[PDB]
């Protein structure tokens, strides 16, 4: 039983648990038993949750950031239903109280014992909120549709829960012996080394003597470092680069100078190096696992006797404003002297003080830390900055995590991609970020879901495979049931991979109709119908994927041959008609990031009362160049529509009418007006988002429209101006915005306003994007690695300007776009 589970975990995470044992590594072992313990208690806590509290755990509320409506309501075990008319202002309780009246009359004769499930989804309506505040009711209003709900009794929710149970002495300089290696090249080889605390060096780098390429290299030399051993900060990182010269880089490697138990390191180490793209401070501090083939350096840390880092108990014993909103060396010195008044009267400037503190002198670090221990808790915004690699100290990190606990679950979810990436910066396996993510994920099943997937999707990256593998193991121990739910997902993804391979093979040797019918036969096999059916969507756990409609599935006959998979569900009706796209061969990470950023804009816009009718569709990497994109139904590409085919509702006398004609046929009579407004709002949002993000090569192939008028972007797949990208107005959208008239300055200028509001609201949260992109640097995305990428956002949001200033600047950009539009 505990052997079945171990095997289930092994299959789910894509790494066998026996591989953890074989490392005979006490840090891995200690991480495992402690994190198992932590996760088991969390699971125990959850099995006694109240029924409302469980709903909160398993089906967290989906909310928006007088008027009448129709609702259909039924009860759990009957098909008979009642249609009521209520107010968009009424709470779920009144509707429930209403539904119980109708039952008592029909069956010839307490609302608070129920919750309302959205039919055929894992989504529930409860709490003291007006119906219009629930994403679902809210969404229903905009599309016309009647909300459909089931009354579920508390006794039934509890049955769900139950079924789901489980020191300063050493004054001599620091130094190492560089012994030998075993490697491949073409000329002479040099080892260069630096001591780092984040990006900042703790002293100058020191180089090797030249030795010939023939090697199996030999050195037997002492590299001495210009810094007292008693000064090495807790998080001292020692870094190596091996290269050749008569410059040609070969490999690099890093390690911490203290182990995970705070002990200084001795004596001999063998470092298995990673291939190079010279010093790489940000690289992992674990050696290359491919030890058969990896070049290796042998070194020797010299025993100065054990020696540990001193307990905090010991450590605790031991024109300003005009600048405070990069600084000269005299400005630095001023801040440091003011550290106390910084604490008392500028607590939000912590980050700036941390960057001036001298991490290569131990006495100053004791100073800074002592101030940190009484430092007031900081705003989330400020805390997200502190998580950056320019703050490696474990005390700083703990303060940051401590400031971050006041994150709501909706916020945490919004920034989960970045917090996971920042695991790649960590020095050690057991850390505060890991416990934090595990804890919040075990308290919220939606967080759990995406945490799992963000980690699972990277298991083929050797630098994170062990770390990420271990976290998912701990997660599973805390939720046996959710483990199985995710296995169902992994098995579906495994079959889709097999199905996509067949399509790639078949389609090269036969015509599209022929392969299509083959795909269907392949899907109609028992093993497939079953593996592909009855799962939660990896794109959204509240979306249930029930019956694959084989007949509606296809593939696109191009490059990587992505698959199109439709689902239906009687229980959910029209709402359970949903689709996924499976893509294998392409990397989806950049698109996911882009889409999260756009969805962030939408939330920020909505919090100022601006709704730009965005389309934040699912996009999720699940494996090695593998993931999923959510089908947005009732949509088509601008290119396709602009083919202006005859025999169609939308056939134009002039190609420029095509897109308007299409909208007309989808939205007759008085419906046309709202579709044009939907188009205008959505167009403004994507124009501003693409501009702020530096995304170009937009064209009719990678823009789409919904039948409601909503325009949205797909397949980005470059950003931050690396292809300065101009603002873009396509004449074809301008034509539609203008209701089909040559001149319509009343409509075009309401459009300009939309853009100007959207843009000015983002500037107010400019720092949030900057902090978020800074952390994303951890992802290893080629287009998001250096500072010229961050600078791109600095320039697009004109953060160093006044709002009047930037708004004029933006107005020049917009007018330039208008001229470019024919």
Ligand X SMILES: CC(=O)Nc1nc2ccc(-c3nn(Cc4cc5ccccc5nc4N4CCN(C)CC4)c4ncnc(N)c34)cc2s1
Query: Which residue's CB is nearer to ligand X, number 283 or number 616?
Result: 616
Q: Which stretch binds ligand X (CB under 6 A): 123-131, 430-438, 578-586, 777-785?
A: 578-586
| Collapsed DSSP state (helix, strand, coil) of residue 522 | helix
Q: Which stretch binds ligand X (CB under 6 A): 84-92, 126-134, 275-283, 550-558?
A: 550-558
Output the smallest distance, CB 639 to ligand X, in A.
9
Per-residue contact string for residues 499-538; x = within reach of ligand X by CB under 6 A: ----------------------------------------
Is 581 a binding residue for ligand X by CB under 6 A? The answer is yes
Q: How far is CA 433 from the centre of its chain?
A: 15
> At 358, phi and psi to the nearest 5?
-95, 100
Whether 274 contacts 318, CB under 8 Å: no
| Collapsed DSSP state (helix, strand, coil) of residue 584 | strand
Among residues 14, 439, 573, 717, which is the contact residue for ligand X, using CB under 6 A? 717
Query: Which residue's CB is nearer to ligand X, number 427 or number 667?
Result: 667
Token couple for 391 = 């703050």
Among residues 555, 605, 679, 773, which is the contact residue for ligand X, using CB under 6 A? 555
Is 554 a binding residue for ligand X by CB under 6 A? The answer is yes
E strand intervals along 692-741 = 703-706, 711-713
Query: Which residue's CB is nearer to ligand X, number 56 or number 594?
Result: 594
CA distances from 366 to 360, 374, 395, 657 (A): 11, 13, 11, 71
Query: Which residue's CB is nearer to ligand X, number 444 or number 596?
Result: 596
Output the smallest distance, CB 584 to ligand X, in A.
11
Output the smallest distance, CB 629 to ligand X, in A.
5
Query: Which residue's CB is nearer to ligand X, number 453 or number 555?
Result: 555
- Spell out the residues 6+ positions from residue 71 whose beta carbon is closer than 8 angstroms to its own: 83, 84, 85, 86, 95, 146, 147, 148, 149
Among residues 714, 729, 797, 798, which is the contact residue for ligand X, using CB under 6 A? 714
Distance CA 701, CA 689 (A): 18
Whether 703 contacts 712, CB under 8 Å: yes
Per-residue contact string for residues 625-664; x = within reach of ligand X by CB under 6 A: ----xxxx--xxx--x------------------------
Per-residue contact string for residues 670-709; x = within reach of ligand X by CB under 6 A: ----------------------------------------
Output the smallest distance, CB 25 to ligand X, in A.
38
Whether 73 contacts 95, CB under 8 Å: yes
Output the smallest distance, CB 623 to ligand X, in A.
15
Chain positions 382 to 441 lying near ligand X, rule: CB under 6 A, are none
Among residues 546, 547, 715, 756, which is the contact residue for ligand X, using CB under 6 A? 715
Q: Which residue has the tokens 């905009």?
A: 142
Query: Which residue's CB is nearer to ligand X, number 259 or number 586?
Result: 586
Q: Which stretch binds ligand X (CB under 6 A): 210-218, 317-325, 584-592, 791-799?
A: 584-592
Output the smallest distance, CB 676 to ligand X, in A.
21
- Spell out the residues 6+ positions from residue 611 whose beta carbon is closer than 8 angstroms to its own: 605, 681
Query: Which residue's CB is nearer to ligand X, number 483 or number 496?
Result: 496
Q: Which stretch binds ligand X (CB under 6 A): 104-112, 472-480, 585-593, 680-688?
A: 585-593
Query: Which residue's CB is nearer to ligand X, number 160 or number 781?
Result: 781
Partners of residue 275 on adjacent β-strands: 251
Chain positions 557 to 576 lying near ligand X, rule: CB under 6 A, are 562, 564
Chain positions 592 to 631 lying near ligand X, rule: CB under 6 A, are 617, 629-631
Report how many residues bind ligand X under the rule CB under 6 A.
Answer: 22
Whether 770 contacts 382, CB under 8 Å: no
Whether 561 contacts 514, CB under 8 Å: no
Question: Residues 256, 360, 197, 389: what is their CA dihedral angle, to the nearest 10 degrees?
Answer: 140
Is 160 a binding residue for ligand X by CB under 6 A? The answer is no
Distance CA 192, CA 180 (A): 14
Task: Report the 10 Å Cβ neighbour count for 613.
Answer: 21
Among residues 550, 556, 672, 728, which is the contact residue for ligand X, using CB under 6 A? 556
Output the smallest distance, CB 691 to ligand X, in A.
20
Q: Which stretch binds ligand X (CB under 6 A): 11-19, 27-35, 586-594, 743-751?
A: 586-594
| Collapsed DSSP state (helix, strand, coil) of residue 281 | coil
DSSP string covering 480-501, please? HHHHHHHHHHHHHHHHHHHHHH
Distance CA 643, CA 757 (A): 34
Query: Which residue's CB is nearer to ligand X, number 479 or number 710?
Result: 710
**Residue of 585, 564, 581 lying closest to 619 (CA atoms):** 581
Task: Report the 10 Å Cβ neighbour count for 706.
Answer: 20
Q: Which residue has the tokens 């930037």?
A: 806
Task: Report the 10 Å Cβ neighbour count for 595.
Answer: 22
Binding site for ligand X (CB under 6 A): 554-556, 562, 564, 581, 583, 586, 588, 591, 617, 629-632, 635-637, 640, 714-715, 717
């Amino acid at each position: 039983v505990k052997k079945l589970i171990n095997s289930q975990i092994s299959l789910l995470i894509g790494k066998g648990l026996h591989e953890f044992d074989s490392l005979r590594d006490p840090e891995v072992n200690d991480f495992r038993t402690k994190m198992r313990q932590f996760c088991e208690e969390a699971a125990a806590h959850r099995q006694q949750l109240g029924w409302v509290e469980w709903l909160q755990y398993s089906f967290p509320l989906q909310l928006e950031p007088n008027r009448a409506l129709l609702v259909n309501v039924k009860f759990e075990g009957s098909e008979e239903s009642f249609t009521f008319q209520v107010s968009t202002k009424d709470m779920p309780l009144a509707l429930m109280a209403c539904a119980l009246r109708k039952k008592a009359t029909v069956f010839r004769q307490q609302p608070e014992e129920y919750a309302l499930q959205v039919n055929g989804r894992h989504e529930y309506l409860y709490g003291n909120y007006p119906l219009c505040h629930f994403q679902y009711i809210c969404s229903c209003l905009h599309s016309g549709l009647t909300p459909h709900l089931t009354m579920v009794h508390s006794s039934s929710i509890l049955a769900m829960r139950d079924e789901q149970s489980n020191l300063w002495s050493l004054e001599q300089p620091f130094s190492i012996e560089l012994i030998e290696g075993r490697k491949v090249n073409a000329m002479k080889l040099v080892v260069q080394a630096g001591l780092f605390h984040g990006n900042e060096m703790l002293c100058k780098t020191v180089s090797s003597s030249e030795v010939n390429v023939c090697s199996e290299p030999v050195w037997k030399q002492r590299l001495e470092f210009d810094i007292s051993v008693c000064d090495l900060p807790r998080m001292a990182r020692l870094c190596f680069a091996l290269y050749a010269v008569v410059d040609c880089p070969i490999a690099w490697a890093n390690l911490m100078l203290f182990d995970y138990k705070d002990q200084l390191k001795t004596g001999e180490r063998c470092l298995y190096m990673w291939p190079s793209v010279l010093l790489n401070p940000a690289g992992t501090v674990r050696g290359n696992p491919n030890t058969e083939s990896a070049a290796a350096l042998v070194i020797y840390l010299p025993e100065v006797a054990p020696v540990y880092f001193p307990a905090l108990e010991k450590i605790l014993e031991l024109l300003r404003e005009i600048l405070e909103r990069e600084l000269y060396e005299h400005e630095k010195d001023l801040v440091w002297k003011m550290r106390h008044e910084v604490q008392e009267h500028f607590p939000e400037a912590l980050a700036r003080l941390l960057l001036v503190t001298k991490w290569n002198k131990h006495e100053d670090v004791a100073q800074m830390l002592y101030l940190l221990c009484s430092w007031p808790e900081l705003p989330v915004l400020s805390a997200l900055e502190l998580l950056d690699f320019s703050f490696p100290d474990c005390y700083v990190g703990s303060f940051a995590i401590k400031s971050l606990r006041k994150l709501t679950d909706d916020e945490l979810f919004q920034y989960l991609l970045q917090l996971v990436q920042v695991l790649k910066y960590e020095s050690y396996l057991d850390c505060e970020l890991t416990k934090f993510l595990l804890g919040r994920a075990l308290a919220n099943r939606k967080i759990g879901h995406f945490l799992f997937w963000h980690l699972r999707s990277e298991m083929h990256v050797p630098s994170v495979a062990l770390r990420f593998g271990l976290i998912m193991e701990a997660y599973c121990r805390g939720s046996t049931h959710h483990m199985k739910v995710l296995m169902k997902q992994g098995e579906a993804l495994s079959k889709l991979k097999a199905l996509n391979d067949f399509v790639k093979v078949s389609s090269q040797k036969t015509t599209k109709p022929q392969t299509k019918e083959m795909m269907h036969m392949c899907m109609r096999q028992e093993t497939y119908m079953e593996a592909l059916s009855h799962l939660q969507s990896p794109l959204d756990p509240s979306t249930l994927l029930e019956e694959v409609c084989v007949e509606q599935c296809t593939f696109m006959d191009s490059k990587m041959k992505p698959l199109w998979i439709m689902y239906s569900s009687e229980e959910a009706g029209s709402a359970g008609n949903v689709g996924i796209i499976f893509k294998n061969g392409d990397d989806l990470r950049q698109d996911m990031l882009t889409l999260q950023m756009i969805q962030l804009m939408d939330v920020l816009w909505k919090q100022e009362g601006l709704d730009l009718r965005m389309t934040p569709y699912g996009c999720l990497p699940t494996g090695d160049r593998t993931g999923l994109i959510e089908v947005v139904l009732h949509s088509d590409t601008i290119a396709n529509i602009q083919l202006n085919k005859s025999n169609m509702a939308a056939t134009a006398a002039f190609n420029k009418d095509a897109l308007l004609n299409w909208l007309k046929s989808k939205n007759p009579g008085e419906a046309l007006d709202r579709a044009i407004e939907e188009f205008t709002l959505s167009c403004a949002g994507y124009c501003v988002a693409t501009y702020v993000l530096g995304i170009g090569d937009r064209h009719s192939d990678n823009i789409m429209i919904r039948e409601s008028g909503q325009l949205f972007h797909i397949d980005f797949g470059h950003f931050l101006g690396n292809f300065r990208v101009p603002f873009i107005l396509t004449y074809d959208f301008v034509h539609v915005i203008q209701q089909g008239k040559t001149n319509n300055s009343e409509k075009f200028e309401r459009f300009r306003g939309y853009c100007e509001r959207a843009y000015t609201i983002l500037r107010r949260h400019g720092l949030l994007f900057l902090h978020l992109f800074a952390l994303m640097r951890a992802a290893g995305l080629p287009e998001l690695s250096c500072s010229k990428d961050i600078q791109y956002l600095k320039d697009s949001l004109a953060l160093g300007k006044t709002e009047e200033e930037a708004l004029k600047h933006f107005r020049v950009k917009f007018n330039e776009a208008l001229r470019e539009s024919w």
